[PDB]
Symmetry: D2
Subunit: 427 residues, 4 copies
């Protein structure tokens, strides 16, 4: 019967944000569909010690509306622990607590529909809207949802280098780490492959028990250094509306060349952790020479499993321009995630703007179609820059989505916060 103003497909932290922000808006009928039974965010990398890299004000709502009851501070109050959080005096939430908070919010909301796997989406020429075919996971029932606008907040999927595909059975991706940790620690050697925060957290986790179990503990990365995530406040001003307006110079190549070489700004390791790793190598080394190796500049060219019972990683050191091999029993592939458009998007291919490399040619308002109806959350890294996976700019993006969806500026979008001037400007 009744057409929705928008349907959100996927309830990651971004669409969960949109949901908290959209619920109290007058005359906005929106619904969110997810296939899982509840919210559960990236639980394979929930080590006890792990925090977010982002202060708590980058919760679901506060940067758009601090008065929202879905705030992290309000959560803390309802759980009856806000004074403890006050005494803690720490800007950075534990991942476990953020996950608990997101679950509390998802439970409180009314506009979420869990256990709803979207199977196909199509544009109905006769009704002039989008038709979303779902399947209820608990009952099997088929249902169709009508909507003027879609907002695609699907997650990305685990990614390993192309040459590793034949050994998926042996190595463990970061996402499978916690489950296979006990099995890894029984091995003679472990190698973490990858540059980011996940790799570092894992490396630190294993380094903790290097004296307790046998293992050699290696870390190989393509990155030129173990670079920290750049957190100096003048650079943080680049994660801003003003910079994003600037960044829409509109020259795509520049954008793509900028995104390689701005990796300090989004793909870095938390500075504290790099230093904690050095300090732990130092402390462990007091009992004897440690059996560790750490390489940089190193691309994985090929790999192979030997009868011996070991991997042989062929590596290319790009700076030196010289190839070399390394061996390991255990292999943790902390190579992160890649977004690729979900199966259901096949049904609206001709309605989507694609760029030269067959990804979404995303517009400034986060839209993927030719009429401001199909929007995307995350997966605009190539055209909106390093700011896209940031929870800190979730409220910004959600606020402009709500502006497009509803016509009005529902949440005011702060477009002059920064001391710098980014574009050229004469006097």
């Amino acid at each position: 019967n009744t057409i929705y103003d928008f349907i959100g497909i996927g309830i990651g932290p971004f669409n969960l944000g949109l949901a908290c922000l959209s619920e109290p808006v007058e005359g906005l009928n929106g619904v969110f569909l997810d296939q899982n039974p509840g919210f559960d965010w990236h639980t394979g990398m929930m080590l006890e010690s792990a925090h977010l890299q982002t202060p708590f004000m980058a919760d679901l709502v506060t940067l758009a509306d601090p008065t929202s009851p879905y705030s992290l501070l309000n959560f803390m109050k309802q759980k009856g622990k806000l004074y403890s959080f006050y005494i803690r005096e720490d800007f950075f939430l534990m991942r476990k607590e953020y996950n608990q908070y997101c679950q509390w919010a998802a439970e409180r909301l009314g506009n979420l529909r869990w256990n709803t796997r979207v199977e196909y989406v199509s544009y109905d020429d006769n009704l002039q809207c989008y038709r979303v075919r779902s399947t209820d996971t608990v009952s099997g029932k088929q249902q169709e949802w009508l909507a003027h606008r879609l907002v695609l907040g699907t997650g990305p999927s685990a990614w390993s280098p192309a040459c590793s595909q034949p050994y998926r059975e042996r190595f463990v991706h970061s996402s499978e780490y916690l489950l296979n940790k006990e099995k890894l620690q029984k091995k003679r050697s472990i190698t973490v492959l990858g540059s980011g925060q996940s790799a570092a957290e894992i490396y630190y986790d294993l380094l903790t028990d290097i004296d307790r179990f046998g293992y050699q503990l290696n870390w190989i990365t393509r990155a030129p250094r173990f670079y920290p995530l750049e957190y100096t406040k003048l650079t943080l001003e680049m994660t801003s509306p003003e910079w994003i307006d600037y960044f829409h110079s509109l020259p795509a190549a520049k954008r793509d060349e900028l995104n390689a070489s701005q990796k300090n700004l989004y793909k870095g390791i938390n500075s504290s952790l790099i230093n904690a790793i050095y300090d732990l190598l130092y402390v462990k080394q007091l009992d004897g020479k440690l059996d560790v190796n750490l390489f940089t500049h190193s691309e994985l060219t090929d790999m192979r499993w030997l009868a011996e019972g070991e991997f042989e990683l062929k590596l290319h050191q790009q700076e030196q321009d010289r190839a070399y091999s390394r061996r390991t029993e255990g292999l943790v592939m902390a190579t992160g995630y890649h977004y690729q458009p979900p199966a259901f998007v096949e049904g609206i291919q001709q309605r989507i703007q694609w760029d030269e490399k067959d990804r979404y040619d995303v517009q400034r308002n986060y839209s993927i179609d030719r009429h401001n109806q199909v929007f995307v959350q995350n997966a605009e890294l190539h055209t909106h820059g390093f700011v896209t996976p940031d929870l800190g700019m979730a409220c910004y993006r959600n606020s402009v989505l709500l502006r497009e969806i509803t016509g009005r500026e529902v949440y005011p979008v702060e477009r002059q916060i920064a001391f710098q001037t980014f574009p050229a400007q004469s006097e």
Copy 2:
């Protein structure tokens, strides 16, 4: 004419808090009276570098209700700078910003009445309520306000030692520092007298320009050391409902001895600042021997002004048990504040419970009468302990006041926040 559910007398940060918390409550008609023309908090000490000692969640409302539009985060949002505050990533507001924030809140509110000096309060036996006689400061106009309940957020007054009263004209209390700074810095010698955060902030401020002007810069304190404010997280659990219950059940004599021995918990200097002062003495000393003196254990016994154009401070070093004199032109008296019950309370003396030392015998719900009608904000240090001047426990206190005023629990009041157990407690 119309009887109020409660009247707040005084609009400091505590009653301004109560005001933000009470405004949206259904079936609560409250009003707040203050004699000043607007909110303007401790502007003599409002130095550019000065922060609050307390994270921003101890704003007017957040610890009772983070969704309130009077929150510091909402203020930051409406001013259009929340992202800058996010980048700053600092828990501690500048005093200048807190003051700007409190002013914004006071402006937004409807329940505040400025320029209204309360002159007398009395209990009307026939109407069975309190009668508050005010005077408009600008026009002189008399008005009477009727109310079932009062909440006294009058605040404490600046205090200097008894022997200093004859020289009020020459020395400067910390509260008047910024107005007299330029006049102090022209002098040959300045002496900060007192141990607290204000003393230290002033000492640091003056030490910054010791190179630039002539002055000798002295610091004398009665305190045994320049003790820091204890800010380790296990001690912060003592600023909790459970500790306050514990403290309030301890005999009257015990509580007073606790308040004199627990000055590191509330009357201390922020440890960063103590260290910044040492580091600045170190850096300044690289150009020559500094002209500074710092004494401890030293009680001011007497003072006097000489024809020469100098004070002579007579001091007694209590540990050594030996007297000595010191000289100074400028004198900053950073000796803090003392509460004494305001003039208007004379009219309800018979209705107030007094303890053995003629102060309010305050009950656990912050009430001073025999019927839960006259409440106090920040005059219960002697019965509720070191947590009383804390902005961090303003929402707690306001939340229990609102529970008494309106019989329901309007904002949830934690009974238990802490991992420690303070009172004795047997197992099984």
Copy 3:
């Protein structure tokens, strides 16, 4: 045959300091006797994470003589790791590294005699000097050493409350913790009793594994709070020659009343650790209500072992003035150490100045006799104040010992470093 200028009895870090400082002094013939086979300092509290509470410049020599080859910096250089230490950029040595450093120094020195248990000391009226009777631990051989002066750097011994003596067999002192940890963690409940750094380190160690094993983890202390060690720089000026001169007001009672109530200055917990404990309680509590109890103001009045298989601690909460009981299976008594004069001192009792409570009536130059010949290192807390167990004032004390022993001021003693004036002073 030949009389020594001084003999040091005991080679703790204090006499080991004196030894490094005395070795290069011209015309000073001194020797140091210890019963153990080498240096090994307080190895029961060497947890991996534990640091000293004192910057590395408070090593054996640097505050008296930074050019000494026994410096921590020189140690780091000879081991070939000084650049690593530079990158670490941490003032506070790991206890394990300090111990390794002290061992390196002890090995390099020539004036140390290990495996030499002093059995008796006496004053020879005819030779007019001290006669020290030793026993070689490896060979059994008796030997006598002659000396004009003695410097007693014996360690203190483990101490538990008087009421605990009948249960020495069941509870574990902090010094026995590492050995009994595995046995403690199998129990249903553990209780750390005591206020200091040791108690806190242990509490943190056990709290780490509270989710992994069953246990209830309690902490009871007589202290009014879990007070931190006061490290603010204006208070650190009280650990200074100028303050020590002041502190010799000469009124003993004041000194004794000062030493209770100056416990923040020497008996505190490192601030970082208190906060790390709060932060870890916070993180653990995310999985469920934690089974922990923490009491303060609580004196242990009596204890008893029940047939049930549990201790019953009777406690008195001194502030509230109310008694209460608590139960626990495991009991870690982190009640620290007490010095008492060693057996051999019996032979020179009449030559030693004793005060009203039968401890050494120590003079300003650290001497215990009536002629500036018998000196003591540590064990002058009652008359020199909170500064005495500090490694930071080891060089100061050693420098004044060398001044008394040799007559000359061998190492200059810095007597005007402090911005404050401590005594009364008119103008």
Copy 4:
């Protein structure tokens, strides 16, 4: 008359280091020549608040020999303040203190010859050694020094963009900042041009008094961001012998591309300072909109002085690829320093190995001749990488110089300090 084992020309912190390290070596007769009257290091940038970017163990000697009496810790001891330094508990010396320390060392040494400008150097074929012709700055007297080996610690010179040369009289280089500060602060507008630590320190210094004087305070940089100096400990392992060996084996073209892409490793701003600048902009902005501008990606293409009494900076924003102009009265050119071989090196051109770009083809032992006799301190950035201006690798370099000069290894030279492996390396 007497032939020296080596002569050091220039007494910067590097050759002053070599001097302290060489003095106690048996059978080493060395002497050091400098044209100035004493040691006085970068006094235009010696602001009260300014620290070194490098822990105190990177003093003149400690990383080669902590027992040396020229150590910073020994200095502190002789001055009678080591306990104060212990209480300070800060790894980073104030520049003023480092300067005082270097002066104390220079005074204690015997092997330094001040007021001695080297004018020409030549190789004597018959004596088989180097002949160094000096001129006494005070008296004009000529002297010739003979030596088997030279070590050139001349240092780099202040550098401004090519288009600025006609206005040297009006703008101020960072090196002349403290002398011209009072004159800058009288102006209506000031513009700091440049990205580095000096620029930032100056910008912070001026921002402090933006309230007090009129000025507009601008900051323009060619750099893409105000990048911090990378100080995370895994990256600090790149300042190591193993990394330097790795760097020096990379083809000439590769090394030059590395030195332009690795400016965060040596030409960055201290992260505390970047954040202190943001925090100070934040605090100042509480009184009104600040009159500041900050541009990035901006190359200075041209400049010109107008009759009005102002510069007009023409800038090109390289990322956007768009030109724009800006105006300023005061101009601080914080564009750093460049090495170019001093005049005297003309006389030994034929004896020096030159690379494809006419700079010294420096060998791994820091030598520039074909026989391990002419060495350089801090002119090998193009062949030994980003670690060259680091005081932290001064003792390393001095230790290998001493090994070449005297054939024995006088101070032990680490081959391997780091947990990482930088070059490719196969297993078995």
